[PDB]
């Protein structure tokens, strides 16, 4: 049995006639050492995707790197979020509107000179002064014109099967 | 085994001169649950097919650029889910807040409003919904951009806005209004005068509170309410489990494991088995991606419907016949859900009908009198004017009827006198 | 004599470890509620025999 | 220049699909070469049928993938076009009471304008401004009567 | 519930819905009925023929 992984002590109670062990989806996760009969646990080594956060080419040239689903223990400023470990962006206690959405309610942006990672702000904190005997009535109006753009059709393309293949 | 029954055999007692008019109402609260987003999952093509074998990867490069297309599709699906959630919920400009005093004219919103002791802004019904619902080979589950805390905050902002300012905050600024006058306007919307509310404020408040209690009881007791959300979760889990199990079918090769194939055979004789495994795994991944694309399209349609329902029922009052509950719409309240949103549709439904004799018009001095608003009814000897949606008879007067024509063209015009 | 097999005659089929998993396997098993002969004659051993004895 | 996000997105998606197909025309798929003419010229038909079949399988699979993606995209575009037709009918040819179907605020009228592969609506909307605090009352008592 | 109403008053309400007073119907009930019957006949003819 050949594989790559990390071996740790396991609490699995193999019967004295079982050597292997299959988790869900029929994968070998436990093995028995053939010299000491030790019950070892096999788990895959750490892995994940990397993501690059860029404020634009013609605005800056520095980037922040996010190692998704990777604890910071595995390889400028490192900051731990709910989606992997972040490198190259400093943490701020301020709240701004989301610019580059990282995940789990955490965004990143380019503010003064450097990349900053914060918790996005949903909006203002307006509290209407509701009272059981007072109402507010408008005295003026400002008619407004807005736009809404909706695609309706694609390009009519037809590909010949025979000429494409042969 | 039987033949199913479509329903009862009610036969309305239609007559050419008799109508039925309700004398009482029983406002009702119902629910409608709509999923809005799926779990953001992205599967690595190379690690799924090969994992770590460089020979398998070099064989995979010969197939072209399938893996890039699959990754692009999955990324698009994840971004689409985030956009769906944002469109459904992020509709409010400012995070409104309910005033500390709860003098809402007898209406009790404690079950739906957030509680500081409870986790974040999650309410009682939101807690019931969240409790009601019941690594790998290249598989990753991405976290949503909007956490449940922020979604609950958006929902609480919407609730505070609609309770305080009515439908005004959905168009311009938040113009405050006492809840009683707001409900009076909403009754005026469905064709019932405001005095009906103002004279039955306590009864309407009691009915609304009882309806909210019934909703919370039916949500806490029965577990079949969240059928759609559970269905979506089960479908996604089934697809992932099928992919993981497909990782372990021979596909014709000597073995279903790549490491033993590499260890037992030389590359010239191992390329055939590696190619068989590659073909099978690529086909399975393509099937998974296509099914996910179709499911994402369906979920996007559902999320668009949910956003439209929010805009036209929470931020206003809809005249559409059965868009939001059965009956005549009054207002709706949003509540969060694990991967969806539930709307509590408060609806005015008439009850306690009463037979009456009617007439198209009234003949007076040879003139034809039609009702300005309402309908002519008779209790057997006298004739009165009442609104169509309630029994509030009034003495016929020139101030609530308009004259046009004579008593020769209208069919069914009856003798009577009009007081001025 | 005859008796019903009830749910007797299930063994570990593949000597591998599995926990909290429902596993479906095909192997030579004794069917449930079958007719098991109750008793030293000659017995036609056919691709497996479930032999059970008491005290 | 960021106004026409959706139209540019659709154009880019279609161009990406076509470019991917054209580039898929040039992957060996296991055969001796990615060009058919050299396969025919270098080998006899009994020994060339294998490479031709490998190329045929790969190209057919790529074409099927392209067709399926195009079908899904066409479904999405058809949904968008149905929404656009409904918006035209109920906002240009009338005034809609739906709360936020056509712009934010209270609808007044809309104007259509053409676009390369779409349509843009200019939603004219009445939004109130300059609020003012006031004290209100549900009714008025006069001679013992209630006035609404 | 099913609250009964004579069809003439129902059509009067439906005219009031589209912004036309009910006396318009009540004074042209026969003409409107004839037009509706003719329209139904045209529908059945167009369905049976084409
Ligand atoms: C940078 O790019 C943006 C958009 O691509 C453009 O609007 C801006 O003018 C550019 N700035 C410079 C200095 O080129
Ligand atoms: C990351 O690693 C450190 C050091 O081993 C450990 O203390 C920490 O708990 C780990 N993170 C998580 C989420 O377990
Ligand atoms: C930001 O918050 C962290 C966490 O409490 C704290 O250690 C730090 O001093 C804060 N910085 C500022 C500038 O408030
Ligand atoms: C609202 O109802 C809850 C329980 O249904 C009750 O505890 C609470 O007191 C009520 N609100 C008011 C203002 O009485
Ligand atoms: C009204 O009268 C009809 C018969 O004329 C009868 O069938 C029906 O039950 C009555 N309904 C009420 C509410 O009295
Ligand atoms: C109808 O109402 C009038 C009210 O003036 C009353 O006098 C009369 O007795 C009523 N008729 C019946 C049959 O109840
Ligand atoms: C209703 O029908 C009866 C008999 O069918 C008739 O006598 C009466 O005139 C009719 N009234 C109207 C308003 O059509
Ligand atoms: C009362 O109605 C009758 C119809 O039955 C008819 O005589 C006339 O319209 C009225 N009588 C008058 C005006 O004397
Ligand atoms: C109305 O009064 C409330 C307090 O009663 C105040 O918070 C609010 O700003 C006032 N609004 C206007 C428009 O005067």
PDB file of N, CA, C and O in Angstrom, chain B residues 86-131:
ATOM      1  N   UNK B  86     -27.285  38.526  -2.703  1.00  0.00           N
ATOM      2  CA  UNK B  86     -27.212  39.980  -2.597  1.00  0.00           C
ATOM      3  C   UNK B  86     -28.447  40.647  -3.189  1.00  0.00           C
ATOM      4  O   UNK B  86     -28.987  41.592  -2.606  1.00  0.00           O
ATOM      5  N   UNK B  87     -28.912  40.173  -4.346  1.00  0.00           N
ATOM      6  CA  UNK B  87     -30.097  40.763  -4.960  1.00  0.00           C
ATOM      7  C   UNK B  87     -31.336  40.542  -4.108  1.00  0.00           C
ATOM      8  O   UNK B  87     -32.178  41.437  -3.985  1.00  0.00           O
ATOM      9  N   UNK B  88     -31.479  39.350  -3.526  1.00  0.00           N
ATOM     10  CA  UNK B  88     -32.670  39.077  -2.727  1.00  0.00           C
ATOM     11  C   UNK B  88     -32.697  39.956  -1.484  1.00  0.00           C
ATOM     12  O   UNK B  88     -33.721  40.575  -1.170  1.00  0.00           O
ATOM     13  N   UNK B  89     -31.578  40.040  -0.764  1.00  0.00           N
ATOM     14  CA  UNK B  89     -31.606  40.667   0.555  1.00  0.00           C
ATOM     15  C   UNK B  89     -31.141  42.119   0.557  1.00  0.00           C
ATOM     16  O   UNK B  89     -31.789  42.967   1.175  1.00  0.00           O
ATOM     17  N   UNK B  90     -30.034  42.431  -0.117  1.00  0.00           N
ATOM     18  CA  UNK B  90     -29.475  43.783  -0.089  1.00  0.00           C
ATOM     19  C   UNK B  90     -30.333  44.694  -0.963  1.00  0.00           C
ATOM     20  O   UNK B  90     -30.026  44.984  -2.121  1.00  0.00           O
ATOM     21  N   UNK B  91     -31.439  45.152  -0.381  1.00  0.00           N
ATOM     22  CA  UNK B  91     -32.348  46.072  -1.046  1.00  0.00           C
ATOM     23  C   UNK B  91     -32.595  47.353  -0.263  1.00  0.00           C
ATOM     24  O   UNK B  91     -33.321  48.223  -0.756  1.00  0.00           O
ATOM     25  N   UNK B  92     -32.028  47.492   0.929  1.00  0.00           N
ATOM     26  CA  UNK B  92     -32.326  48.605   1.819  1.00  0.00           C
ATOM     27  C   UNK B  92     -31.125  49.541   1.857  1.00  0.00           C
ATOM     28  O   UNK B  92     -29.975  49.093   1.942  1.00  0.00           O
ATOM     29  N   UNK B  93     -31.391  50.846   1.757  1.00  0.00           N
ATOM     30  CA  UNK B  93     -30.311  51.827   1.714  1.00  0.00           C
ATOM     31  C   UNK B  93     -29.635  51.971   3.072  1.00  0.00           C
ATOM     32  O   UNK B  93     -28.403  51.970   3.167  1.00  0.00           O
ATOM     33  N   UNK B  94     -30.425  52.095   4.136  1.00  0.00           N
ATOM     34  CA  UNK B  94     -29.911  52.337   5.475  1.00  0.00           C
ATOM     35  C   UNK B  94     -30.434  51.269   6.422  1.00  0.00           C
ATOM     36  O   UNK B  94     -31.571  50.816   6.289  1.00  0.00           O
ATOM     37  N   UNK B  95     -29.608  50.882   7.391  1.00  0.00           N
ATOM     38  CA  UNK B  95     -29.989  49.860   8.361  1.00  0.00           C
ATOM     39  C   UNK B  95     -30.898  50.528   9.390  1.00  0.00           C
ATOM     40  O   UNK B  95     -30.425  51.137  10.351  1.00  0.00           O
ATOM     41  N   UNK B  96     -32.207  50.417   9.189  1.00  0.00           N
ATOM     42  CA  UNK B  96     -33.160  51.010  10.113  1.00  0.00           C
ATOM     43  C   UNK B  96     -33.184  50.234  11.426  1.00  0.00           C
ATOM     44  O   UNK B  96     -32.702  49.103  11.521  1.00  0.00           O
ATOM     45  N   UNK B  97     -33.754  50.861  12.452  1.00  0.00           N
ATOM     46  CA  UNK B  97     -33.818  50.257  13.774  1.00  0.00           C
ATOM     47  C   UNK B  97     -35.150  50.599  14.423  1.00  0.00           C
ATOM     48  O   UNK B  97     -35.591  51.750  14.371  1.00  0.00           O
ATOM     49  N   UNK B  98     -35.782  49.598  15.027  1.00  0.00           N
ATOM     50  CA  UNK B  98     -37.064  49.802  15.678  1.00  0.00           C
ATOM     51  C   UNK B  98     -36.887  50.636  16.947  1.00  0.00           C
ATOM     52  O   UNK B  98     -35.963  50.398  17.729  1.00  0.00           O
ATOM     53  N   UNK B  99     -37.756  51.625  17.169  1.00  0.00           N
ATOM     54  CA  UNK B  99     -37.636  52.442  18.374  1.00  0.00           C
ATOM     55  C   UNK B  99     -37.818  51.598  19.622  1.00  0.00           C
ATOM     56  O   UNK B  99     -38.524  50.575  19.599  1.00  0.00           O
ATOM     57  N   UNK B 100     -37.186  51.979  20.736  1.00  0.00           N
ATOM     58  CA  UNK B 100     -37.282  51.154  21.953  1.00  0.00           C
ATOM     59  C   UNK B 100     -38.698  50.991  22.472  1.00  0.00           C
ATOM     60  O   UNK B 100     -39.012  49.949  23.061  1.00  0.00           O
ATOM     61  N   UNK B 101     -39.560  51.984  22.281  1.00  0.00           N
ATOM     62  CA  UNK B 101     -40.953  51.895  22.704  1.00  0.00           C
ATOM     63  C   UNK B 101     -41.734  51.105  21.662  1.00  0.00           C
ATOM     64  O   UNK B 101     -41.558  51.302  20.454  1.00  0.00           O
ATOM     65  N   UNK B 102     -42.585  50.196  22.130  1.00  0.00           N
ATOM     66  CA  UNK B 102     -43.327  49.282  21.264  1.00  0.00           C
ATOM     67  C   UNK B 102     -44.817  49.596  21.240  1.00  0.00           C
ATOM     68  O   UNK B 102     -45.654  48.690  21.249  1.00  0.00           O
ATOM     69  N   UNK B 103     -45.176  50.881  21.218  1.00  0.00           N
ATOM     70  CA  UNK B 103     -46.577  51.298  21.161  1.00  0.00           C
ATOM     71  C   UNK B 103     -47.064  51.243  19.712  1.00  0.00           C
ATOM     72  O   UNK B 103     -47.261  52.256  19.038  1.00  0.00           O
ATOM     73  N   UNK B 104     -47.265  50.013  19.235  1.00  0.00           N
ATOM     74  CA  UNK B 104     -47.700  49.765  17.865  1.00  0.00           C
ATOM     75  C   UNK B 104     -49.209  49.607  17.745  1.00  0.00           C
ATOM     76  O   UNK B 104     -49.685  48.926  16.829  1.00  0.00           O
ATOM     77  N   UNK B 105     -49.973  50.218  18.642  1.00  0.00           N
ATOM     78  CA  UNK B 105     -51.421  50.145  18.562  1.00  0.00           C
ATOM     79  C   UNK B 105     -51.997  48.761  18.762  1.00  0.00           C
ATOM     80  O   UNK B 105     -52.935  48.376  18.053  1.00  0.00           O
ATOM     81  N   UNK B 106     -51.458  47.998  19.712  1.00  0.00           N
ATOM     82  CA  UNK B 106     -51.991  46.698  20.047  1.00  0.00           C
ATOM     83  C   UNK B 106     -51.401  45.535  19.281  1.00  0.00           C
ATOM     84  O   UNK B 106     -51.676  44.382  19.634  1.00  0.00           O
ATOM     85  N   UNK B 107     -50.601  45.792  18.251  1.00  0.00           N
ATOM     86  CA  UNK B 107     -49.959  44.727  17.496  1.00  0.00           C
ATOM     87  C   UNK B 107     -48.652  44.332  18.168  1.00  0.00           C
ATOM     88  O   UNK B 107     -47.893  45.188  18.632  1.00  0.00           O
ATOM     89  N   UNK B 108     -48.399  43.029  18.223  1.00  0.00           N
ATOM     90  CA  UNK B 108     -47.256  42.467  18.933  1.00  0.00           C
ATOM     91  C   UNK B 108     -46.308  41.853  17.912  1.00  0.00           C
ATOM     92  O   UNK B 108     -46.640  40.852  17.269  1.00  0.00           O
ATOM     93  N   UNK B 109     -45.125  42.452  17.768  1.00  0.00           N
ATOM     94  CA  UNK B 109     -44.116  41.993  16.822  1.00  0.00           C
ATOM     95  C   UNK B 109     -42.911  41.371  17.515  1.00  0.00           C
ATOM     96  O   UNK B 109     -41.828  41.306  16.926  1.00  0.00           O
ATOM     97  N   UNK B 110     -43.072  40.917  18.759  1.00  0.00           N
ATOM     98  CA  UNK B 110     -41.933  40.393  19.503  1.00  0.00           C
ATOM     99  C   UNK B 110     -41.432  39.079  18.923  1.00  0.00           C
ATOM    100  O   UNK B 110     -40.243  38.766  19.041  1.00  0.00           O
ATOM    101  N   UNK B 111     -42.315  38.297  18.298  1.00  0.00           N
ATOM    102  CA  UNK B 111     -41.899  37.007  17.762  1.00  0.00           C
ATOM    103  C   UNK B 111     -40.993  37.162  16.550  1.00  0.00           C
ATOM    104  O   UNK B 111     -40.122  36.316  16.321  1.00  0.00           O
ATOM    105  N   UNK B 112     -41.172  38.223  15.768  1.00  0.00           N
ATOM    106  CA  UNK B 112     -40.414  38.408  14.540  1.00  0.00           C
ATOM    107  C   UNK B 112     -39.284  39.421  14.681  1.00  0.00           C
ATOM    108  O   UNK B 112     -38.303  39.335  13.925  1.00  0.00           O
ATOM    109  N   UNK B 113     -39.379  40.369  15.606  1.00  0.00           N
ATOM    110  CA  UNK B 113     -38.311  41.334  15.791  1.00  0.00           C
ATOM    111  C   UNK B 113     -37.110  40.676  16.475  1.00  0.00           C
ATOM    112  O   UNK B 113     -37.266  39.702  17.216  1.00  0.00           O
ATOM    113  N   UNK B 114     -35.903  41.186  16.237  1.00  0.00           N
ATOM    114  CA  UNK B 114     -34.719  40.586  16.856  1.00  0.00           C
ATOM    115  C   UNK B 114     -34.707  40.776  18.364  1.00  0.00           C
ATOM    116  O   UNK B 114     -35.296  41.715  18.904  1.00  0.00           O
ATOM    117  N   UNK B 115     -34.021  39.860  19.044  1.00  0.00           N
ATOM    118  CA  UNK B 115     -33.867  39.905  20.485  1.00  0.00           C
ATOM    119  C   UNK B 115     -32.392  40.032  20.839  1.00  0.00           C
ATOM    120  O   UNK B 115     -31.569  39.253  20.335  1.00  0.00           O
ATOM    121  N   UNK B 116     -32.013  40.998  21.681  1.00  0.00           N
ATOM    122  CA  UNK B 116     -30.587  41.154  22.024  1.00  0.00           C
ATOM    123  C   UNK B 116     -29.981  39.938  22.701  1.00  0.00           C
ATOM    124  O   UNK B 116     -28.795  39.655  22.494  1.00  0.00           O
ATOM    125  N   UNK B 117     -30.756  39.208  23.509  1.00  0.00           N
ATOM    126  CA  UNK B 117     -30.212  38.042  24.198  1.00  0.00           C
ATOM    127  C   UNK B 117     -29.907  36.913  23.223  1.00  0.00           C
ATOM    128  O   UNK B 117     -28.937  36.169  23.409  1.00  0.00           O
ATOM    129  N   UNK B 118     -30.725  36.765  22.183  1.00  0.00           N
ATOM    130  CA  UNK B 118     -30.511  35.723  21.196  1.00  0.00           C
ATOM    131  C   UNK B 118     -29.286  36.039  20.340  1.00  0.00           C
ATOM    132  O   UNK B 118     -28.886  37.199  20.216  1.00  0.00           O
ATOM    133  N   UNK B 119     -28.653  35.006  19.756  1.00  0.00           N
ATOM    134  CA  UNK B 119     -27.449  35.231  18.943  1.00  0.00           C
ATOM    135  C   UNK B 119     -27.636  36.260  17.838  1.00  0.00           C
ATOM    136  O   UNK B 119     -28.445  36.068  16.924  1.00  0.00           O
ATOM    137  N   UNK B 120     -26.878  37.352  17.922  1.00  0.00           N
ATOM    138  CA  UNK B 120     -26.859  38.424  16.918  1.00  0.00           C
ATOM    139  C   UNK B 120     -28.275  38.981  16.790  1.00  0.00           C
ATOM    140  O   UNK B 120     -28.927  39.222  17.818  1.00  0.00           O
ATOM    141  N   UNK B 121     -28.789  39.198  15.579  1.00  0.00           N
ATOM    142  CA  UNK B 121     -30.125  39.736  15.371  1.00  0.00           C
ATOM    143  C   UNK B 121     -31.133  38.655  15.003  1.00  0.00           C
ATOM    144  O   UNK B 121     -32.208  38.970  14.483  1.00  0.00           O
ATOM    145  N   UNK B 122     -30.804  37.392  15.250  1.00  0.00           N
ATOM    146  CA  UNK B 122     -31.708  36.306  14.903  1.00  0.00           C
ATOM    147  C   UNK B 122     -32.916  36.320  15.831  1.00  0.00           C
ATOM    148  O   UNK B 122     -32.772  36.358  17.055  1.00  0.00           O
ATOM    149  N   UNK B 123     -34.110  36.287  15.244  1.00  0.00           N
ATOM    150  CA  UNK B 123     -35.344  36.352  16.006  1.00  0.00           C
ATOM    151  C   UNK B 123     -35.764  34.958  16.464  1.00  0.00           C
ATOM    152  O   UNK B 123     -35.051  33.969  16.280  1.00  0.00           O
ATOM    153  N   UNK B 124     -36.946  34.880  17.078  1.00  0.00           N
ATOM    154  CA  UNK B 124     -37.453  33.599  17.558  1.00  0.00           C
ATOM    155  C   UNK B 124     -37.815  32.681  16.397  1.00  0.00           C
ATOM    156  O   UNK B 124     -37.415  31.510  16.367  1.00  0.00           O
ATOM    157  N   UNK B 125     -38.568  33.198  15.424  1.00  0.00           N
ATOM    158  CA  UNK B 125     -38.961  32.382  14.280  1.00  0.00           C
ATOM    159  C   UNK B 125     -37.748  32.045  13.422  1.00  0.00           C
ATOM    160  O   UNK B 125     -37.649  30.942  12.872  1.00  0.00           O
ATOM    161  N   UNK B 126     -36.806  32.982  13.295  1.00  0.00           N
ATOM    162  CA  UNK B 126     -35.572  32.681  12.577  1.00  0.00           C
ATOM    163  C   UNK B 126     -34.782  31.585  13.282  1.00  0.00           C
ATOM    164  O   UNK B 126     -34.196  30.716  12.627  1.00  0.00           O
ATOM    165  N   UNK B 127     -34.757  31.606  14.618  1.00  0.00           N
ATOM    166  CA  UNK B 127     -34.119  30.524  15.363  1.00  0.00           C
ATOM    167  C   UNK B 127     -34.809  29.192  15.109  1.00  0.00           C
ATOM    168  O   UNK B 127     -34.144  28.165  14.922  1.00  0.00           O
ATOM    169  N   UNK B 128     -36.143  29.185  15.106  1.00  0.00           N
ATOM    170  CA  UNK B 128     -36.868  27.949  14.833  1.00  0.00           C
ATOM    171  C   UNK B 128     -36.549  27.424  13.441  1.00  0.00           C
ATOM    172  O   UNK B 128     -36.362  26.217  13.252  1.00  0.00           O
ATOM    173  N   UNK B 129     -36.483  28.317  12.452  1.00  0.00           N
ATOM    174  CA  UNK B 129     -36.165  27.893  11.091  1.00  0.00           C
ATOM    175  C   UNK B 129     -34.740  27.365  10.992  1.00  0.00           C
ATOM    176  O   UNK B 129     -34.492  26.362  10.313  1.00  0.00           O
ATOM    177  N   UNK B 130     -33.789  28.028  11.653  1.00  0.00           N
ATOM    178  CA  UNK B 130     -32.397  27.598  11.568  1.00  0.00           C
ATOM    179  C   UNK B 130     -32.163  26.289  12.307  1.00  0.00           C
ATOM    180  O   UNK B 130     -31.256  25.532  11.946  1.00  0.00           O
ATOM    181  N   UNK B 131     -32.952  26.009  13.343  1.00  0.00           N
ATOM    182  CA  UNK B 131     -32.856  24.731  14.033  1.00  0.00           C
ATOM    183  C   UNK B 131     -33.669  23.633  13.366  1.00  0.00           C
ATOM    184  O   UNK B 131     -33.400  22.451  13.602  1.00  0.00           O
TER     185      UNK B 131
END
